Every structure is written in C-alpha cells, then in structure tokens.
Design a protein around this ligand. Sequence first.
Ligand SMILES: Nc1ccc(S(=O)(=O)N2CCN(c3ccc(C(O)(C(F)(F)F)C(F)(F)F)cc3)CC2)cn1
Ligand SMILES: O=P(O)(O)OC[C@@H](O)[C@@H](O)[C@H](O)[C@@H](O)CO
Length: 585
Amino acid sequence: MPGTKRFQHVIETPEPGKWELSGYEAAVPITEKSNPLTQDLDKADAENIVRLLGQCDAEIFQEEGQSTYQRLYSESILTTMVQVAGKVQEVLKEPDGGLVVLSGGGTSGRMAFLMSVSFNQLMKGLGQKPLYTYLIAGGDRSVVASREGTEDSALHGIEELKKVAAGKKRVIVIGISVGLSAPFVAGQMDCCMNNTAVFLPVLVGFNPVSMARNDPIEDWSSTFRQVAERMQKMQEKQKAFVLNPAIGPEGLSGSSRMKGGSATKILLETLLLAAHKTVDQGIAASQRCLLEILRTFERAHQVTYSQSPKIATLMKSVSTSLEKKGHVYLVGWQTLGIIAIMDGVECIHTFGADFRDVRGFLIFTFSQEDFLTSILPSLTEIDTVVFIFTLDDNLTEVQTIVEQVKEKTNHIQALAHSTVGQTLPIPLKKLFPSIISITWPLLFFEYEGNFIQKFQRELSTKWVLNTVSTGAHVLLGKILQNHMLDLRISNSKLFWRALAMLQRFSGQSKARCIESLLRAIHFPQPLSDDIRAAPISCHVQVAHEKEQVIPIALLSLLFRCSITEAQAHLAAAPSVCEAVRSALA
Ligand SMILES: Nc1ccc(S(=O)(=O)N2CCN(c3ccc(C(O)(C(F)(F)F)C(F)(F)F)cc3)CC2)cn1
Ligand SMILES: O=P(O)(O)OC[C@@H](O)[C@@H](O)[C@H](O)[C@@H](O)CO
C-alpha cells in the first residue's frame, strides 16, 4: 500500500513477553540496543551514574566470550589492525601523491579531525609533509557545530571525498560510522571500491556487518550493508578492510558519541601510531606493538575512573546550575579545549539543550583577555566553570582566569593532567580545594610531542566530560530508563529511533506507531497518501522544526486518542516528563 516499501525494513512489534522469541531483539544492532547495566539509569544517583557509565566504557576492552561477536582484543580484529597499519606504511614509504583520509558524520567526524591533526603534527615533528586529512558531514563547520541532518546524503560524501582526493595516486579512506549507518560514509566506501587502482577503503564501526544498516538511502542505490558485505569479500584480496569490533551498547541507548567515539580513537590512534613508529624501525607492525598501545589505553580507563567521587561531584554541580537556569563553561587549552567544545555542542542534539547550557572554550576559540572582557561579565552565583589543562600548559594564563572567575562565581571544580611529581604552582592553588587530579605514570616515547601522552589525556578528558554532561541531564529527569524519548528528529536514523521507541513503550502495532508519528509530525495536516509514501527526508525536514513530536505521538497511542487530544493533555500536565511517565504508569 501507500508507504509499504518506505517502512518494509521495520520489524513488527512483538507481543507482550515475546521480544526475544519473535527475534525482533536479535535484529536490533548492538549500537542501538538498551544496555542492561543501565536499565534504571534514570533512578541512579550521581555516584551510581559514574559507576554505571564507567562500567559501560569498560566494555570496550572486554574480551570475546567462548559462540559470539568479535571484540577489540580478538585475533581477527587485531590481525585486521595489523594489515591496515601495513597499507598505511606503503603510503608513508611513498608520500608523493599519497593521502590518508579519515571521514565520518557527527562525532565520527569530530574524532576524524582530532586524529588527522595529531598524525599531521607527528609528521611535521619529523619534517615530513602532512599526509592526513579529515572529512566531516556538512564541511568543516560541522567539527564544532550541531548539524545532525548533514549525514543523509551519499553524493555529498562522494563530493567531499572527490575534492580532497585531487590528483592523488594512492588514497586511504577510513570511513568511520559507529552504527555502520551513515549514508555520507557509504557512498565514499562504494566509490573507493569502484576505483581500487587509487583508493583503499577501510570501514570502521562497531556492529557486525550482519547488523549494518539496510534501509534505502535516498540518493543512492545500495545500502550500507551491501557496501560493507562487499568490502568484507575484498578483504581476502586485501583491497578493503572492515574493522568492526563489538563494544556493547551505549549506557544511553544509541548515544554513539560516547563509547563509539571513544573506541574510534582507541582503535585508530593505536594502529596509526603503530604504523608510524614501526616504519622508522624498519620492522612490520605486529600484534605485539598494537597490544602495548591498547593496554595503555585500557590503563587510561582505570586511571580515569579511580577519580570517580570527584567526577560525581562535578556532575552534581553541573546538574544544579542547569536545574536553576545557569550555564556551564568548559574552559580548556589546546586539544582538550576543543574536546570541551565538542562535548558542549553535542548536548544540544543529545539532550535538546541550548548552546549556553554546556558550552566549551579553547585558549569558541577565545583569547585570555577576550574571555575576561566578553564572557566573564555574564557569569553568576549559580553557574559552574570547569578548567581543563595539563601542567605543561601556561599556568600563568590559567591562574589569572580562575582568579577572575572565582570572584563572579564560586562553583569552579577543575581537571588537571600531570606526569608524576609535577607539583602545581601556588600551594595556595586552593583556588581549587579537591581538584580532579589525574596523574600519569612515566612511559617510553620516542616521538616528538609525546603522542601517546596526548592520546591518553584527550581520551580521559572525553570520558570525564561525556559522563559529566550526560549524568547532569539524567539527574534532571530528562531520560526515560536509558532512552532519550524526547529527541529531535533531524536525520533518518533519528526518525527510525523514534519509531522504535514508540513501539517499545506503547507495545502497539507497527502500523499504529507509524501513524501516530506521521500525524504528530505533520499535524495540523491529516495523513494523505502522498504523506504516507513520502521519502523519510520529508518527515525529517518537518519534524526537525517541532517540539515534543515524540512524546505527543506516544500519548496519542497510550490514550488511544487524537493529536488534538494529546497536545491538549500535554499542555495541561506540569511537564513533558511527568505527562509521559504518568501516562506510561
Ligand atoms: N546499523 C543500523 C543502524 C541504524 C539503523 S536504523 O536507523 O534503521 N534504526 C535505528 C534505531 N533502531 C532501534 C533503536 C532502538 C530500539 C529499542 O527498541 C531498544 F530498546 F532496543 F533501544 C528502543 F527501545 F529504543 F526503541 C530498537 C531499534 C533500529 C534501526 C539500522 N541499522
Ligand atoms: O558514527 P555513526 O553511527 O555514523 O553516527 C554518526 C552521528 O550520527 C553520531 O556521531 C551522532 O551525531 C551523535 O550525536 C551520536 O551520539
């Protein structure tokens, strides 16, 4: 009928109690699943939250069980990492007309960028011409902006890839898509496979290829799945690679900026860094070289989360300022500044939060006085300001800005990375009572700017800020179990996530859920046959513009009532969250 093929991939809602037996749950990609550790995340207190997310993040390093999915430390994955290091080496050997592209949408795009800078530094440090570049969905703008809608075009991905691949002779394209989902990457990988002579595609994400996305893409004929299955066949001739360890679901379902983006760095820093370091040695990269690095990253988690109580406290101070109407400033230097910006921006689409709510800053890119003059006066009793640096930074720029802020505000916890026995000027730097002191062992490093210390630190900061930003909002009651129900539908993936949440929470048929959603989106216009049959991009473009789409749609279903009736109920309840939870009751 009208809309049958648009919605064909959607599995029917199972009956009460048979979610397993129907096998609907077997087809939910690992990346979208509900993480059982966080079933009650919306009841956890701050310290619980930090523990549950610490646990979730730990799952990245968990090893393979005895009929089950390959993981980071499984031999197949490390062997693929080794082969890829190899191919990166051939390019490094012969940089003339060589290029290495790291590409993704959203947080995969952000991760791509950091890493292309890092490995560009590393080659500058050795006086080699930089061979790395990034590509992000929607151009460079996207690195530091919330722009969730730009991932949905395969021709845009191919366009962007054709720009930077110029008249290069040998190009490595690392397509990063956590969910093995983004149309932006799918076209790139497919294009590479059509010109092997020049391109080598390497696909990175965290689902088995059997769970790769498989609904049609509006500007492209193949699906992500087909593209990935065909890359996997090519791997046997070593002309494509798929690097896809399971890392377990996200503690907030489908919030792939968290574990997904973490594991992206872990996986890609590790392997690239191996390729470089072993290329100067005239040795092949080996599982043993990768393992040293992976184990360092695994220590980095333990190191990071041992500071848990201070993490729960910072969370509680971020949650408080938001619970009033304050604002949160993440102030950090060099790449940890960026990471802070990245975190704050991602809270907009992730939690429906305003850009002032949690906002990052680098010394978005403001100077010492500049921040003192412009941003400083706007601060207030109820806010929180977070400072993020190493002892190697310029603590005379640091101490100044804190002095200033300690006046206009008092909540000013802070995040300081140190190699052991660095001290921390001003013993009267009880400007911060009990800092988040993270001190790193000494470790070997032959390269110039100590790249492995950078990677550790960036990851540990990412983990802290993510757990913080995410916990603060959970505490405010905005998360339903371990799902963000009331999200903004701004891309096709988010539209499927919405439809999925409608089925799960209502228990009602696929057809009713779809109808309640489309009515909610297009109200006041009734359901027509054109609307039923529209490409999903038409629903997205209309929903993106509205508020409470999903909660309205869910109420209409639970109450078995019209959109006019559910909007009126909603507006009569004290709050969205209360309207929904009590309707669910
Ligand atoms: N690899 C991929 C990635 C995305 C897609 S998708 O965009 O078509 N869609 C994403 C959301 N998705 C989904 C999300 C959440 C659920 C849930 O059922 C649960 F519990 F599993 F999270 C929820 F309750 F959230 F709805 C179920 C399915 C199914 C597939 C398909 N394959
Ligand atoms: O890497 P994927 O699966 O292609 O996801 C790409 C982006 O949608 C994703 O990074 C998203 O922006 C984040 O808000 C998810 O928390």
